[PDB]
Amino acid sequence: PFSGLKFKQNSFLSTVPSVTNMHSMHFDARETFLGVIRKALEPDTSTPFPVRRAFDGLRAEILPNDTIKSAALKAQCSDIDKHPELKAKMETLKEVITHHPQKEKLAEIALQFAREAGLTRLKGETDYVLSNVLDGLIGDGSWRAGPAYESYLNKP
Amino acid sequence: TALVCDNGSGLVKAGFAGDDAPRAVFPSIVGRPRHQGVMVGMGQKDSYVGDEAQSKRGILTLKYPIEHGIITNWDDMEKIWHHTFYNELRVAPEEHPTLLTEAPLNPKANREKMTQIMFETFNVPAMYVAIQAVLSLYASGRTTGIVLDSGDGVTHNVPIYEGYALPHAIMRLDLAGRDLTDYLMKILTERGYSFVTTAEREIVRDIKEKLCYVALDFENEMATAASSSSLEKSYELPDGQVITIGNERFRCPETLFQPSFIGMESAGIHETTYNSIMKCDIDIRKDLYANNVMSGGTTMYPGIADRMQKEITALAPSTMKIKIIAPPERKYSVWIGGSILASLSTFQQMWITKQEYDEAGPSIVHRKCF
Amino acid sequence: TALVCDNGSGLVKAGFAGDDAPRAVFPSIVGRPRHQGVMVGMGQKDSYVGDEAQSKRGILTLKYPIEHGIITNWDDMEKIWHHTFYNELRVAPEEHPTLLTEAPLNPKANREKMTQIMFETFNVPAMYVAIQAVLSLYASGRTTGIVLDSGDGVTHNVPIYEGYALPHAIMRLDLAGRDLTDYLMKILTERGYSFVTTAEREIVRDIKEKLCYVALDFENEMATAASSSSLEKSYELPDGQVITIGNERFRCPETLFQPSFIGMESAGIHETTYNSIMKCDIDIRKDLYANNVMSGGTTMYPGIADRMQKEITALAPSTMKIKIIAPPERKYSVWIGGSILASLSTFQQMWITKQEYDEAGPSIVHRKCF
Amino acid sequence: TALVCDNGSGLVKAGFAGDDAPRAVFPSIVGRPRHQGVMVGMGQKDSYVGDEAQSKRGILTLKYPIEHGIITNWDDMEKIWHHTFYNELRVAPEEHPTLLTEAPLNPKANREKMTQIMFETFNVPAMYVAIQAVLSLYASGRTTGIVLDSGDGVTHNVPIYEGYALPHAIMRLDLAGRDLTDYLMKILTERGYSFVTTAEREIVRDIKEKLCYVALDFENEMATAASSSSLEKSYELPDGQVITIGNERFRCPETLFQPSFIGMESAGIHETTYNSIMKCDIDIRKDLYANNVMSGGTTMYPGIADRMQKEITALAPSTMKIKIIAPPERKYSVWIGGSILASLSTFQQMWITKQEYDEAGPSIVHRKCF
């Protein structure tokens, strides 16, 4: 679908919040994490213009900057069964994510978000967009089983 | 009315065409919290823009969306522009054509994207991208002269004669205020002062702006500083601690004339200006020698004009008259020129209209704008 | 023969040039009694130094004269040097040139006062102050490479190519073993082990040296610790009590790669190394990538070399060959390099002589030393 | 035997007369370290020449002693020649007549200094200074034809008929590979790639050498590039970074045919060759049209011969047969011709001998040579 699409490597690192802020009582794990993925998916300038404009429309629709648009997309994906076009777009974007040259690092960031900020606290009930993005980074889908936690009490 | 937004690397100078000074001047930074929690109703706002980020600087991680005159974080740049239009100017961008600036020899995708955002995200009726050096000449009122524009990200000089630019003679150095700021915090460690955070980098920038100056003769100034304490100045940090700096006052600006201080192989701004003039036609060099116009914050160091006068005079033939024009409104020369250009009746046909963008796309900027 | 004294924030490594290992390696601490004695003939010594202070730490307040590579208590540093020369090496300092070491980007007054004490208090015939990262390369035997030196107080990167250092690319990070020790104290309170006082900071330093390690994948290690309990290990305190430590084993060293968890805004050592390389000339980066030399005690964590290799490989372009050099003697590599340098025939003209000192004062150190 | 040293602006081609290819080919650069210190005992030198300068290019400042065919730094040129004779050819210049080459219409002091240094410094028994365009004809084996020699410094045309040059018809443009390298550096910034150092100029030179080509129809190629990415090629920098280059591949060599790209008020090489032929006698133009011979590295661009055939054919009358002779070894054609000339028995009485020089002085070169 998007041949010749290239990304500037390490462009998304500056967008990852500090672990201390991930523990904030009003931290928005979904929006902040999707911001990292949006930044990581920003096409490199070396990509041909037709592909850039084509892909920029895909990620702009699926990973919008505006909170109003992001929330509207979230609600519209709750009944994704009635929105095949989003199904195709989300499927297309997930295909791009799984081929991202730095998918391993993005997977580590996603796991850090789940570990610290509770990104995947809903487990299997995660919204369609966030679940698809994670499935792209984590192919097996094991993240649906939330992070393992220490449970200090009753320790041997 | 037309909006003039001089989105520099360090500061955003925005206002309305026809005014004498920008209405809004705030830092071009987006700060996001880096600490934890912990109070209900006190952390809903993620990211702060401009002066608010500077005020809450202590708990944020500040980041400039523009580096070396190139927009590197377009999501943050969108936040900066949204802050400018709606929060600082209190205008609807869809009702005003917007003139904005950029440095010469920038990546073309930089102009293309900013054209794309202005038309598709803000629905501006029309827009224009001007060269900052050219606007400075508009502000000075001349039609001939070699401008030396040095802001936070990039320093460049554009030789213009009788209104004609010599694009083969443009110069660009990625050595500007921010590079000087970084050097100052590096040489401040020699006195035991450690500034490492982005919040503290702003304090070092304030120290630079308040205390740094250009020595007329560097070697003599170094000897004077070594031999006596007359050049030492004290500065009070936000928490009450007092720091004193001696030769660091003029060593930091000296990097402009000696880029090797920060490991750069390039030549000083004095020699780059002379090289730019030497690349121009021999018949116009005399006029350029007499119309070196400074603009940008990085040219606000005390004694910079006298140093540039001395350095170029030693390079140019002795029979030329070297004149440095450094207006007190140097720091806003670019915005003033943009305001002049935007309000010119003969300029109203040079806008990129929304209709033109629709037919041609973001590539229209390369045809309509220098 | 010349003396090589690697002062260091945590340990004093002292010996003679030409030997393969330092003669004396003792803590850089000075202990003052806290309690009342209280017998006749006991406790007439007002202070204890090095191993003696460590042995008697139960009734002593231990204090490090050097903090973050900077000497903060010069009277105590004089005690340590007096102990090193007279009680550990058993030499008359007036006969032997002394090679000293310090981190880059230190305050100038630190090395100025080092010279003054050596020439006046100890009357050494000559001395020299070397940069620790440079010496580590001497020990490795290479002429090119970027050294990551991480001791107790300072972690700094120095890229060197063909014997030429790129000082503008030198990165310094005030996060080292002592900061990791303090963090281990903090997270050990999550369990019932509340050292939480300055008495037992050395016991948890020993715990850190014995049990802590760097996880190749932090998330996988955290999951394994949460699930299995197979990573739990037990440590016996001097009291005979046994503390069990689980994921704190690899969480404490994780602060090196995530300077957060201690509230630092800087990037991890992997990114600092990469940033240092990217500040260098593009033509030497390939050689730097293949010559990542690690030195200092803080690099002795099991798996840190593997972690550094993985992390830098993720930052650098895929075609580059990343290679971490981690000698088994990297804890003493700095002293070994000092020994090699001090014994070179070509180095015998680089000493700062007593005649040169009193002719020029402590400022001579800046001219003759990097 | 005789030495043939074709030291152009960019490369030094040296060897023995009678050989089919130069023995030593290396860049005409002197590099000097621009960084500090720091390791004693290392095999460091105060300057590096030729291939060694390229190897250690990362930590050096590279200077070309020759620019636009004129030697501007004679001290550097001396060590370039010393490097050629002693370290590359491994000969004693005292016992070898040495043939040198230079471009037409050069300053006479250039030839005089070249002669003076060879006889006084290198004490050669005899020497001769030939014109590069003439030598190319020797290599081609002809005695008639108009030679277009384009190296790193200068492009010149020399029409020759039956061995007779028409010096009033000789053309010389100071536009050659180095100007193309600088232009490629400038237009690469359009894509965000920034090369500013002398070391990085060599990288851009390599990109130009192995990616640029001449477009048969410039406007058609521009449309093709704008419409598709088929013309885009990737190049891996020394640090593993990959740069993608599109229409810049042919826009750089297009400067040869449109000097206005770099602000030069001059005719392209096609028009200069045509203008030269028209300055010749009408009776020889037909043979000149059919014997356009290319030489020099700057003529190695793919498709340049076809472009020149197309361009001149559009200028010359339709009945003339335009033939561009572009041998595969036209990069070394000048040296090959010099080797042929120096090995001719009929040429042996045309050397400037040491006895001749000491009697007449450096000015002898103006009488004995072209």
Ligand SMILES: Nc1ncnc2c1ncn2[C@@H]1O[C@H](COP(=O)(O)OP(=O)(O)O)[C@@H](O)[C@H]1O
């Ligand atoms: N009075 C001053 N003295 C020295 N430097 C100054 C002064 N005022 C501003 N600067 C420097 O100039 C820069 C801002 O210049 P400006 O023209 O606003 O650049 P930009 O157009 O990129 O915002 C800052 O980085 C600051 O360090």
Ligand SMILES: Nc1ncnc2c1ncn2[C@@H]1O[C@H](COP(=O)(O)OP(=O)(O)O)[C@@H](O)[C@H]1O
């Ligand atoms: N085997 C080890 N594992 C982990 N940390 C260690 C080990 N050995 C020493 N360290 C740490 O290294 C520090 C001392 O390193 P060193 O290179 O001596 O620093 P300095 O040169 O400043 O004395 C101590 O704080 C200690 O905690």
Ligand SMILES: Nc1ncnc2c1ncn2[C@@H]1O[C@H](COP(=O)(O)OP(=O)(O)O)[C@@H](O)[C@H]1O
């Ligand atoms: N294959 C090639 N394609 C394009 N340009 C080339 C090629 N080979 C060499 N050049 C250019 O030619 C110049 C060297 O040509 P040369 O004939 O050696 O000049 P000189 O005689 O001054 O040494 C260099 O500047 C280089 O950029």
Ligand SMILES: [Mg+2]
């Ligand atoms: Mg500006």
Ligand SMILES: [Mg+2]
């Ligand atoms: Mg150490």
Ligand SMILES: [Mg+2]
């Ligand atoms: Mg040539």
